[PDB]
């Protein structure tokens, strides 16, 4: 409900309100009230009034480089959000605003015609950014401001919201001056795992903050939205480019080697709900490197991803699907295979640059590219040698592929009745204590004991150990000790009339490192 | 109802979604987060709907999930939880569900007025407004383990529901579960750091202006029922005294031709303290927590901070930083006692108020300036900061008059908000004999609705491949370059608008032009 003159008076008198998280533009989500937008200028507008708030209040640093990233690609310099400022009183010189009736979430889709970019840059961050703020998942309308059309996967964006998303182009239709009484701007990066090579060569994100569990909860949500509730291997085909040239030979060979039905699927020629149905029950997913492989996130736990790379493309340099499959909690096996036989690759040098052609380059650079046996490391996004090799077609050497798969999948592929427990961490040890005794000028003993972590009272853990770090109060040197018991008497290099700092942490099953307790100060 | 809530918790488990890439800028939204009253541990129960964002593995203990106070990375102020399977609930008492949406935080020092306002009240006010529904519906839970403290009435003004302390949680039951809880406080409003790693001083990159301070102050004033010119002296009574109090009041009143008034926290209600400050033309006080009330002063008022002997005003600047914040619009004058006759050292008092070597004690009164030091128990600083001081009145009046020429306060002063230019529009360029390059642009869109005293354009001429440029400052909306220009060369032209010399706007899309 909106009482229009009341809303206009609040806006005109009080102006825009802005509260944002983060100390950097790359780590920032903003909550706005009475944020406006000129659809003529395509600029957002902060109106200064008597209730205005700007947090952060950045001064000239608001353009160094911008207020926040509007896509989830870090610090991309065509994806920034900012606004222009006016006094709220300038409203008297402007057309009367149209008030947007819905709470908004405002963001840029990074590359909405690419299925992988859709899921990784947009859908997963949309899903969880909505869940960052109470009431947004149910109430928000999505506003995509990057300037693209619907694109090939608009119906996937529609699943994330009960309301129809709006595009920038549709905003001028609503009116010349639009005002959002309530709007959130930006997308969390917490679910991203890959970076596309804008500063250094593409590869896994440096500090990944998402696990397979949060991927699978999102996948479960989308499967319900798609009305998706004997074992087989699934070959994910492409029909337009980057072909598997011996697909028929591949299907039969995989069936004979693994004793399983083998089926084909493509994006071009199945409804997406049907694609998800097939992937979500598959024991193994075989595919050329490419966007269709992002559907690996729907595979059941314990399935295998087999990713094929064309001639001169090193699998280790192009790891978005390796990174997804091996993410903790994803529980997918991952196998990479690379065509190393030049007679099994087909080149397309006369295609446009977009499709990997090289006919537009110098004869010299064409010759260097063709004699090149491995794509050099490169930056995003139109490196000619990369596009030339990635758009090759591939005749797959079957016996090497099977050998490659068999080094990872020992026997049957897929989740053969495995049960998956979540791994959780120890709490702090409790009530750490120590006492000392002295035997002579250079000989003393330091006895330490502690109680189990509190959460261990309610757990049954295969292997519980304690790591103790011993440090003399004046030194930067420490000695760590691995212990099975809840106590120990240290002797080596322990001196009388000396103060030692003792840190203790619990460790479950070798790899699950718990927190250190507060330091224990021990004087001999 | 209870059985529905218990089932959701038991089958589904805890759900966590947090902002921020590091623990020092992290705010978390939790559903079905629980708490053991006996262990004083928050509990994350893993169930079939559990979500953990960020999912940090062992890095959740390096050092922790988030800061529970706004003091950055303070190793006694971390938040974390311990983990259990949801099924472990069978070994526990039935949970007590907290039905209110909670906001969980630590108060850093609830007995110090400056810490109360800077570390807690401002961050609480705007953290509540970071998330829809919180400001009106949230109950605050203070988990640091201190009691109500001397300023609990102020914390209560920040919420309609009564805040709960950690002790009152244990009383509600052995196992408490929050159906909906936010954890952490934004640091966006802080401006000072207390010297835990490097000597105390202003925060490196301050993200708050006086406007947001004053919007908060306006809220508090209405909550205190607070809507003839005078100078206000903020007295301390128990320690860090001003000894020539009466002579100070009369000297101030005679020189500035204005009423003078003495105020104190102990003898007035805080509402009346704020009333007095809110319309004071000058606020004179010893360095101390009461000076945080300067955020209530009217625009154009003057802050006069008196520092005892051997305490350099440039080393202890929480109130200078506040007074001189962009948009605070307060004059700041610091006065330091340079005369040892007027200082009154108290070596006899306990270490609490500043027992060591006579060798170390000898150096302490042999020093003229307290050295730069780290928090928090430096007796050299605590001895000197707790002295009483007799104010040299001609020396103070003189250094005030260096800043305040005439009569102080908001006398016939008008402040505008400083707005920045938008991008210039429709930038064009045209190259050419002699190589030449011409550029033109239209005014920023927002300039169409503004009256600005001075509009300039800064233009950067860059040769492609060079990591440098030649800058030009122009009044016109067009230019022809003659100096640098070479034939058959691609140049990049960057343009930004500048209002009144210091309001730099953004650069437009770069112009690429080749000769």
């Amino acid at each position: 409900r909106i009482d229009y003159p009341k809303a206009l008076q609040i806006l005109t008198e009080g102006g825009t309100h802005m509260v944002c998280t983060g100390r950097t533009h790359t780590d920032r989500l903003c909550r706005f009230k009475w944020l406006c937008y000129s659809s003529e200028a395509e600029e957002f507008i902060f109106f200064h009034g008597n209730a205005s708030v700007m947090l952060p209040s950045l001064g000239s640093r608001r353009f160094q480089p911008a207020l926040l990233d509007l896509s989830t690609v870090e610090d991309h310099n065509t994806q920034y959000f900012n606004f222009v400022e006016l006094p709220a009183a300038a409203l008297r010189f402007m057309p009367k605003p149209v008030f947007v009736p819905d709470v908004a979430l405002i963001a840029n889709r990074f590359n909405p015609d690419n299925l992988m970019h859709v899921f990784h840059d947009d859908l997963l961050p949309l899903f969880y950014t909505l869940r960052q703020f109470p009431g947004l998942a149910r109430e928000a309308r999505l506003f995509f401001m990057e300037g693209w059309g619907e694109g090939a996967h608009f119906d996937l964006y529609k699943l994330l919201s009960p309301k129809q998303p709006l595009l920038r182009a549709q905003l001028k239709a609503l009116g010349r001056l639009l005002c959002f009484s309530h709007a959130f701007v930006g997308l969390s990066k917490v679910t991203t795992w890959y970076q596309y090579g804008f500063v250094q060569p593409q590869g896994p994100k440096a500090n990944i903050l998402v696990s397979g569990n949060e991927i699978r909860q999102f996948a479960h949500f989308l499967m319900e939205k798609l009305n998706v509730s004997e074992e087989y291997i699934l070959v994910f085909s492409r029909t337009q480019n980057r072909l598997i040239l011996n697909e028929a030979e591949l299907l039969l060979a995989l069936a004979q080697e693994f004793q399983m039905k083998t089926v084909t699927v493509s994006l071009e020629d199945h409804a997406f709900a049907d694609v998800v149905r097939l992937v979500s029950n598959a024991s193994m997913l075989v595919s050329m490197h490419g966007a269709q492989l992002v559907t690996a996130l729907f595979l059941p736990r314990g399935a295998a991803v087999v990713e094929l790379f064309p001639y001169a493309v090193n699998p280790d340099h192009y790891t978005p699907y390796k990174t997804l499959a091996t993410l903790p909690g994803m529980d997918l096996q991952y196998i990479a295979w690379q065509n190393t036989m030049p007679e099994n690759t087909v080149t397309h040098p006369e295609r446009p640059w977009d499709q990997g052609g090289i006919a537009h380059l110098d004869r010299a650079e064409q010759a260097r590219i063709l004699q090149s046996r491995e794509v050099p490391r490169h930056l995003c996004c139109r490196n000619p040698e990369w596009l030339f090799r990635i758009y090759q077609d591939t005749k797959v050497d079957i016996p090497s592929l099977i050998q490659t798969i068999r080094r990872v999948v020992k026997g049957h592929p897929g989740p053969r009745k495995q049960k998956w427990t979540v791994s959780l961490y120890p709490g702090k040890v409790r009530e750490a204590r120590c006492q000392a005794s002295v035997q002579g000028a250079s000989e003393a003993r330091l006895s330490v004991s502690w109680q189990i972590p509190w959460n261990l009272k309610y757990l049954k853990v295969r292997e519980v150990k304690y790591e103790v770090w011993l440090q003399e109060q004046g030194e930067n040197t420490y000695v760590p000790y691995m212990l099975a018991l809840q106590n120990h008497t240290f002797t080596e290099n322990i001196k009388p009339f000396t103060t030692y700092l003792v840190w203790i942490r619990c460790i479950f099953n070798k790899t699950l490192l718990g927190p250190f307790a507060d330091v224990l100060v021990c004087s001999t | 109802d209870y059985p529905k809530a218990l089932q959701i918790l038991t089958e589904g488990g805890t759900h966590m979604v947090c902002t921020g890439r590091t623990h020092t800028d992290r705010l978390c939204r939790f559903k079905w987060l629980c708490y053991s009253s006996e262990a004083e541990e928050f509990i994350f129960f893993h169930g079939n709907a559990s979500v953990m964002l960020p999912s940090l593995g062992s890095r959740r203990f390096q050092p922790a999930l988030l800061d529970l106070s706004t003091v950055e990375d303070h190793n006694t102020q971390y938040f974390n939880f311990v983990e259990l399977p949801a099924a472990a609930l069978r070994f526990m008492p039935k949970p007590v569900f907290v039905p209110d949406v909670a906001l969980i935080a630590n108060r850093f020092n609830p007995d110090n007025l400056m810490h109360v306002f800077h570390d807690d009240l401002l961050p609480l006010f705007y953290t509540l407004r970071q998330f829809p529904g919180l400001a009106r519906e949230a109950r605050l839970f203070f988990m640091e383990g201190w009691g109500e403290g001397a300023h609990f009435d102020l914390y209560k003004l920040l919420s309609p529901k009564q805040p709960l302390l950690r002790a009152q949680l244990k009383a509600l039951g052995r196992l408490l579960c929050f159906s909906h809880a936010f954890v952490g406080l934004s640091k966006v409003t802080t401006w000072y750091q207390y010297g835990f790693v490097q000597p105390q001083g202003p925060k490196a990159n301050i993200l708050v202006s006086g406007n947001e301070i004053r919007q908060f102050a306006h809220f508090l004033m209405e909550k205190l029922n607070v809507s003839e010119e005078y100078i206000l002296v903020f007295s301390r009574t128990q320690n860090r005294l001003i000894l020539n109090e009466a002579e100070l009041l009369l000297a101030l009143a005679q020189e500035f031709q204005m009423k003078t008034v003495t105020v104190s926290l102990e003898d007035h209600a805080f509402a009346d303290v704020v009333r007095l400050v809110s319309n004071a033309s000058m606020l004179v006080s010893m360095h101390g927590a009461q000076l945080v009330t300067a955020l209530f002063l009217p625009r154009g008022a003057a802050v006069v901070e008196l520092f005892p002997y051997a305490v350099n005003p440039d080393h202890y600047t929480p109130y200078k930083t506040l007074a001189t914040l962009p948009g605070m619009d307060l004059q700041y004058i610091a006065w330091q006692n340079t005369m040892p006759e007027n200082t009154v050292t108290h070596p006899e008092r306990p270490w609490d108020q500043g027992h060591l070597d006579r060798a170390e004690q000898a150096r302490i009164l042999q020093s003229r300036e307290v050295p730069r030091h780290l928090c928090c128990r430096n007796p050299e600083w605590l001895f000197r900061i707790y002295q009483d001081t007799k104010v040299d009145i001609p020396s103070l009046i003189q250094t005030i008059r260096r800043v305040v020429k005439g009569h102080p306060g908001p006398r016939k002063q008008k402040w505008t908000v400083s707005l920045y230019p938008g991008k210039v529009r429709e930038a064009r360029c045209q190259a050419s004999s002699e190589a030449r390059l011409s550029v033109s642009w239209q005014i920023p869109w927002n300039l169409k609705y503004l009256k600005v005293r001075e509009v300039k354009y800064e233009v950067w001429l860059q040769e492609q491949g060079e990591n440098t440029y030649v800058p030009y400052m122009l009044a016109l909306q067009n230019h022809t370059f003659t100096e640098n220009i070479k034939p058959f060369t691609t140049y990049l032209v960057w343009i930004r608008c500048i209002f009144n010399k210091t309001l730099l706007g953004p650069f437009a899309d770069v112009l690429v032009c080749s000769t």
Binding site: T78, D113, D354, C380 | -
Partner: peptide, 12 residues
């Protein structure tokens, strides 16, 4: 078509 960076402004 992946969004490419605009030119980087000189660091000097």
């Amino acid at each position: 078509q992946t969004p490419t960076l605009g030119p980087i402004q000189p660091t000097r």
